[PDB]
C-alpha cells in the first residue's frame, strides 16, 4: 504493497527533466485542497485546537498550518 | 555548428597561459570554448551508454492467485495445518474464526483456520545494477569554420572528416585526442567515474520501460520479490503484500488478490528520470562530466591565406540565437579558393573599427568554385551595430541591435550561475576554472556545505522545501540574535533549489 | 607429483546405484577442493558436482541436481561419487579435478585424473562375433586397401582382438564401443594391407574375451 | 544461463601459422577464464590461468587476451604435436562453472580421391543373421559427409553408424565406415542398393549403384 | 629490484580495478613487452600536464619479472580523497584510469 516510497525524496536533479515533473507542483497542494473542501469543519477544530497552544498569536497559526496539513496525508 | 542553436549553450574563454581550461560538460547542453589565437570548438555530450548489467531483485506487479484453499480446526484441539504450506509457492495466514455445531464441531469457540493460496506472478518488473566502471561516455566535438548550414553543422558526423570528431569516454581510457584535420588535436582529460554517483543508482525495466532509479528508493519496496539468479520457478520472498485475508463476518476467511502495481509504481517513480535500452546496452540521456581541455595541441588553420577579392552575397538572413549571438550566413562570389572572409563588427561603420567580438576565429572558404556558403557566427556589443562581411566596395552590411545592456548580461549570468550550483552542486565551480585560490576554495566551502547538506535534508521533495523554506523565512524574520545567518543561508540555499526548476 | 587414480569401473545397469572412489594421494587434500567433470564421447565438457574444503559444503549442476552426492573422508583423501538414478545420458568418462582453495570454491592450478569408462547398457550377457570385411577382387593382386575384423555384439567393453599375433597391427585401434539401439557393443575399424598375402597368410583374428567366452577362428572373405 | 560459446570451431589452417580462438558469455564475467588442452585419449591439462599465464611445463607460445566478455587465443607457431581441443571454463561467482564446446584444430591433406570400395554383404554372414553392406570411403576431405543408401528409388537414413578415425601425421587418413542395419527380409526385399560418398574436394559424387550378386 | 631499469612502452589495462575496502586500489596490469626486469613507473596524480604524485604507493618498488612477451603484475596504490589518475607508464603511450 500500500505504501510505495516516494522516489522524491532522492530525485536526481539534472539539466533533463524527471518522470513525473508537470504534475509534480500541484499535487500535495491538490490533495490538501480536496479533503479541505469536502471536510470543512476541520478548520474550526484546527482553530479550536490550535488557538489553546502556543499563547503568542503567532504559533497558533504554526500549528494550524501543521495540523491542517498533517490531516489529508496521514503520515 | 552542432551547438549554435541550443538554448543552454554557455561560452568558456581565457586559459591559464594558453595551456588547460576546466569544463563541465551537461548532458543536454553544449559548451562553446573560444580563445584568443585557436579555433573555436563546439562540444556537445550526446550519450551516456552503459553495458555490462548483472540483475538485482526483481519485484513483482502483476500478480495472480490459483486455486485456493482452506481448512479450520476445531477449538482446544490443535491448530490447522495442510500439506499445501510445505511449498513455498503458497501463502497462507493463521486466523481464528466461530465455530458451532451448525458448522460442524463438538465444541463452540474460536477455531484456528488457515487458508492456503498459490501463488504465482504473470508479468515482473526488474531492477539491474549500474557498475561505474562501465560507463561509456561520448563526446562530439566541432570546431566553427568553413561549414554550411546543410550536411556540415547537422548530425551527420558518421565519417572521419575534418572539422569533426567523435570519442569515446570510458574508465578505462579517460583521456583521449581527437583527430581534427588541419586543426591539430584537442586534448580531453575527463574524470568519468565522478558522474551522477552511479553507486547508488540502479536500471530498472518495466513494459519496456527503463529509469535511473535511486538505490535506497529500490531496496525498500513492499512487493513480491526474488533475488534474480533464478531461471525457472521463483521463491517469491514476502508474498503477502499482494493478497489480502479478508474475514468475512468470522464465519469465512476469503483470500484475493490486489490490483496490478503498474500505475502504482509509475507514480512513485516521481523521482527517476528515464532512460532508453537498444540491446544490451542502456543510453542514457542525462548526467554530466568533468574534463579538462588541454588546448595546447589545437592549432589554427587558415591564417596564411589572402583576403577575398569582392562579390559577397546575403543569403540566410541573421538572426539572435537566445544569448546574444548572431548566427550570420554568407554565399561568397569568387574564384579564389582558399580565401579569408574579413568579416567584422562595427559600431559608427565610417570609422570601421572592430567593437564586437567574434566567435568564428578565422573564417575560411575551403570550395574553389563560384557560389561558396559559409556559416559565421558574430556577437555585437549592446546598442547599434553593422556587421560588416566584405572588403572595398562591395562590402555587405546589416543593421543589428542587440537588445540589452551589461548589467542585463550580469543579471542573467548571475541567474545561468544559479541554475549551474542548482544542478552540478560542487562541480559548478570548475566549469570556467582556469586554476586558481578562489575556484579551489571555494570548490572546497561548497564541498563542506554540499555534504553537510545532503547528508542533513537529503529526501525533501518539491512542495517539502518550499514548506520549511517557509518556517525558515519565518524564523529568519523573527528571534534577533546571532544565529540570524543560519537562517538565511539555509532558507536561500532551499529556496532556490526548490524554484529553479 | 601430480597422481590423482580413479576407480569404480565396470557398468551401470538402469536402476542400482555405485561409486566412482578417485584415489587422490600425493598432496595435501584437506584443503584442496574437489571437482567432478565428465566427457562425452562426441560433444563437449559437462560440469557434474564438486566439493567444497569445509565437509559439509557441496554442489551439483542443476540437470544433476538431487540425484549424484559425493562424501570426502579427510583420514583418507578420498571421494565417493555416488551415482544414484543413472539414466541414459550418463554415458561419459568421468574425471577428478583437484584444485586449492581459500574460499568455497576455487582453483589457481587444476589437477585432473586419467578417466573412467561409464557407459549404461541394458542386454543380456552376449559374446563376441566375427563380421569379415574385404573390399573388392579387382585389385588385390598387389597393392593398398582397406579390411577389418568387425567385432559387434559383444557385452562387456572391451575385446581384446588381435591380428596374427601382432603383426597386421598398422590400422588396428582399441575404439570405444558402438552404441547400438539395445545394450550390444559394435567396433569397426580399417587396416593398411600389402594385398600379397591371398593364399599364404590367413587373416584370422583372435576375438577373445574374457567374460563371454566365445572365440570363433574365422577369415575375411573377398 | 552463461553459455559459452565458441567461435570458429575448426580452421583448415597449416602448422607454423596463428590461431585465434575465442570463447563468448551472456552476463558480464570480467576476467576470469581458463583454457583447456585436451588431447584425445590422453589427461586435458590446461593452457592458460585468467587468459595470461600457462601452468608449469607450457611455453609462452600460446597466450590470450581479455576484450569485454571473449577471449581470444593469440598463438605464434604451430607445431603438428599441438593439434588438439580446447575447452574454456567460468570462474565467476558461484558455481558450476561452465564449460565451453570443443574447438580442434584441422590441418590440410590430400583431397585427390575417395575410396570406392563397397564390400558385398558376405553371404555366409547373411546366413548367420545380420548383414554389414560395408560401404567403405577412407584417405578424403573433410571428414563430414551425407551418405544416402538410394535402396530401390527411396531415401533410407537413421541406422547409419560411422566410425571416424583419427588424423593421420603424414596425409590425415580419415574413414567412414557407413552400415545399413537390414534384417534378413530388408534384404530379400531389396535389391538395388547404392552407396554416396559426398567428397567436397571432386565436382561429382561417385554413386556406385551396385546389383545384388555382383563385385 | 632497485637496480632494475624503468619500462619503456606498451602497457596493457586487465582486471579493471576496485576499492579494497580500506581506500587502496589493487591494480592489475600486462607488460606487453620483452624487456625483462624491467620498473614499473606507477604514480598517483591529479592535474595530468603536472604528473605530480599526491597518492603514496603501497607495494614499494614494482617490478615486472618475467622476461616473455606479456608479463603479469598486480600492484595497490592509495589515492587521496578525490579525483586522481592511475598512470602506470612513461612517454606517449602509457595509459591511465581515472579513480574516485
Request: one cysteine or more.
Amino acid at each position: 504493497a500500500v505504501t510505495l516510497p516516494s522516489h522524491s525524496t532522492r530525485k536526481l536533479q539534472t539539466r533533463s527533466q524527471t518522470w513525473l515533473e508537470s504534475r509534480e507542483y500541484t499535487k500535495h497542494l491538490i490533495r490538501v485542497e480536496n479533503w479541505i473542501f469536502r471536510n470543512p469543519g476541520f478548520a474550526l477544530a484546527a482553530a479550536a485546537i490550535a488557538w489553546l497552544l502556543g499563547s503568542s498569536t503567532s504559533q497558533k497559526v504554526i500549528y494550524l498550518v501543521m495540523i491542517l496539513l498533517i490531516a489529508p496525508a496521514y503520515s | 555548428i552542432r551547438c549554435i542553436g541550443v538554448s543552454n549553450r554557455d561560452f568558456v574563454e581565457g586559459m591559464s597561459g594558453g595551456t588547460w581550461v576546466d569544463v563541465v560538460l551537461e548532458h543536454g547542453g553544449c559548451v562553446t570554448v573560444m580563445a584568443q589565437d585557436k579555433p573555436t570548438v563546439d562540444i556537445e555530450l550526446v550519450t551516456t551508454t552503459v553495458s555490462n548489467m548483472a540483475e538485482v531483485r526483481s519485484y513483482c506487479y502483476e500478480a495472480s492467485i490459483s486455486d485456493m484453499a482452506s481448512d479450520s480446526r476445531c477449538p482446544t484441539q490443535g491448530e490447522a495445518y495442510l500439506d499445501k504450506q510445505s511449498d513455498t509457492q503458497y501463502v497462507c495466514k493463521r486466523t481464528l474464526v466461530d465455530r458451532g455445531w451448525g458448522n460442524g464441531c463438538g465444541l463452540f469457540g474460536k477455531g484456528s483456520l488457515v487458508t492456503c493460496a498459490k501463488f504465482a506472478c504473470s508479468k515482473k518488473m526488474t531492477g539491474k545494477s549500474i557498475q561505474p566502471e562501465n560507463l561509456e561516455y561520448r563526446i562530439m566535438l566541432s570546431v566553427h569554420g568553413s561549414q554550411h548550414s546543410g550536411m556540415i553543422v547537422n548530425d551527420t558526423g558518421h565519417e572521419t572528416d575534418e572539422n569533426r570528431a567523435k570519442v569515446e569516454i570510458t574508465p578505462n581510457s579517460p583521456r583521449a585526442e581527437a583527430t581534427l584535420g588541419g586543426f591539430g588535436s584537442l586534448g580531453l582529460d575527463c574524470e568519468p567515474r565522478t558522474g551522477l554517483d552511479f553507486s547508488d543508482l540502479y536500471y530498472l525495466t518495466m513494459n519496456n520501460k527503463h529509469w535511473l532509479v535511486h538505490k535506497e528508493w529500490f531496496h525498500d519496496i513492499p512487493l513480491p520479490w526474488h533475488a534474480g539468479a533464478d531461471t525457472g520457478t521463483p521463491h517469491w520472498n514476502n508474498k503477502e503484500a499482494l493478497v489480502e485475508f479478508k474475514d468475512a463476518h468470522a464465519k469465512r476467511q476469503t483470500v484475493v488478490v490486489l490490483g496490478s502495481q503498474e500505475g502504482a509504481v509509475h507514480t512513485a517513480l516521481a523521482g527517476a528520470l528515464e532512460a532508453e535500452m537498444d540491446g544490451a546496452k542502456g543510453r542514457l540521456s542525462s548526467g554530466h562530466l568533468k574534463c579538462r581541455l588541454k588546448m595546447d595541441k589545437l592549432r589554427l588553420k587558415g591564417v596564411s591565406y589572402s583576403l577575398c577579392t569582392a562579390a559577397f552575397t546575403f543569403t540566410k538572413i541573421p538572426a539572435e540565437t537566445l544569448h546574444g549571438t548572431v548566427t550570420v550566413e554568407v554565399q561568397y562570389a569568387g574564384t579564389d579558393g582558399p580565401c579569408k572572409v574579413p568579416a567584422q563588427m562595427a559600431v559608427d561603420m565610417q570609422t570601421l573599427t572592430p567593437v564586437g567580438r567574434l566567435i568564428t576565429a578565422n573564417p575560411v572558404i575551403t570550395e574553389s568554385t563560384e557560389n561558396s556558403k559559409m556559416m559565421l557566427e558574430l556577437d555585437p556589443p549592446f546598442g547599434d551595430s553593422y556587421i560588416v562581411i566584405g572588403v572595398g566596395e562591395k562590402k555587405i552590411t546589416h543593421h543589428w541591435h542587440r537588445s540589452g545592456s551589461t548589467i542585463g548580461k550580469a543579471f542573467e549570468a548571475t541567474v545561468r550561475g544559479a541554475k549551474r550550483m542548482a544542478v552540478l552542486g560542487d562541480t559548478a565551480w570548475d566549469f570556467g576554472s582556469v586554476g586558481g585560490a578562489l575556484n579551489s576554495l571555494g570548490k572546497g566551502i561548497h564541498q563542506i556545505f554540499g555534504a553537510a547538506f545532503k547528508s542533513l535534508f537529503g529526501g525533501m521533495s518539491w512542495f517539502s522545501q518550499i514548506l520549511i523554506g517557509t518556517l525558515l523565512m519565518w524564523l529568519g524574520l523573527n528571534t534577533k540574535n546571532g544565529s540570524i545567518s543560519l537562517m538565511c543561508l539555509a532558507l536561500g540555499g532551499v529556496l532556490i533549489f526548490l524554484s529553479t526548476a | 607429483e601430480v597422481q590423482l587414480l580413479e576407480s569404480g569401473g565396470g557398468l551401470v545397469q538402469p536402476g542400482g546405484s555405485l561409486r566412482l572412489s578417485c584415489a587422490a594421494s600425493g598432496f595435501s587434500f584437506s584443503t584442496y577442493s574437489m571437482h567432478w567433470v565428465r566427457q562425452a564421447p562426441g560433444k563437449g565438457l559437462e560440469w557434474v558436482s564438486a566439493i567444497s574444503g569445509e565437509g559439509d559444503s557441496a554442489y551439483y549442476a542443476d540437470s544433476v541436481k538431487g540425484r549424484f552426492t559425493i562424501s570426502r573422508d579427510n583420514s583418507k583423501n578420498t571421494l565417493y561419487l555416488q551415482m544414484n538414478k543413472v539414466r541414459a545420458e550418463d554415458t561419459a568418462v568421468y574425471y577428478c579435478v583437484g584444485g586449492y582453495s581459500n574460499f568455497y570454491y576455487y582453483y589457481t592450478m587444476d589437477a585432473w585424473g586419467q578417466g573412467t569408462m561409464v557407459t549404461v547398457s541394458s542386454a543380456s550377457t552376449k559374446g563376441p562375433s566375427v563380421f569379415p570385411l574385404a573390399p573388392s577382387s579387382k585389385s588385390t593382386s598387389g597393392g593398398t586397401a582397406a579390411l577389418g575384423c568387425l567385432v559387434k555384439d559383444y557385452f562387456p567393453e572391451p575385446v581384446t582382438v588381435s591380428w596374427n599375433s601382432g603383426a597386421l597391427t598398422s590400422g588396428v585401434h582399441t575404439f570405444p564401443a558402438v552404441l547400438q539401439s539395445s545394450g550390444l557393443y559394435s567396433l569397426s575399424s580399417v587396416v593398411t594391407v600389402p594385398s600379397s598375402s591371398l593364399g599364404t597368410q590367413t587373416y584370422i583374428c583372435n576375438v577373445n574375451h574374457k567374460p563371454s567366452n566365445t572365440k570363433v577362428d574365422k577369415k575375411v572373405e573377398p | 544461463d552463461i553459455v559459452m560459446t565458441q567461435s570458429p570451431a575448426s580452421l583448415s589452417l597449416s602448422p607454423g601459422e596463428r590461431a585465434t580462438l575465442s570463447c563468448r558469455a551472456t552476463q558480464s564475467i570480467s576476467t576470469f577464464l581458463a583454457w583447456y588442452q585436451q588431447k584425445p585419449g590422453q589427461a586435458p591439462r590446461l593452457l592458460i590461468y585468467d587468459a595470461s599465464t600457462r601452468a608449469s611445463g607450457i611455453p609462452a607460445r600460446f597466450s590470450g587476451s581479455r576484450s569485454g566478455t571473449d577471449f581470444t587465443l593469440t598463438i605464434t607457431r604451430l607445431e603438428p604435436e599441438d593439434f588438439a581441443v580446447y575447452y574454456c571454463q567460468q570462474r565467476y561467482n558461484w558455481p558450476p562453472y561452465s564449460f565451453g564446446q570443443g574447438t580442434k584444430l584441422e590441418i590440410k591433406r590430400t583431397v585427390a580421391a575417395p575410396s570406392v570400395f563397397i564390400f558385398p554383404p558376405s553371404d555366409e554372414q547373411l546366413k548367420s543373421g545380420t548383414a554389414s553392406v560395408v560401404c567403405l570411403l577412407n584417405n578424403f576431405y573433410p571428414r563430414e559427409a551425407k551418405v544416402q543408401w538410394k535402396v530401390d528409388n527411396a531415401l533410407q537414413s537413421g541406422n547409419s553408424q560411422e566410425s571416424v578415425t583419427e588424423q593421420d601425421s603424414k596425409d590425415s587418413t580419415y574413414s567412414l565406415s557407413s552400415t545399413l542395419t537390414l534384417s534378413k527380409a530388408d534384404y530379400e526385399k531389396h535389391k538395388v542398393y547404392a552407396c554416396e560418398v559426398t567428397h567436397q574436394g571432386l565436382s561429382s559424387p561417385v554413386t556406385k549403384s551396385f546389383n545384388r550378386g555382383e563385385c
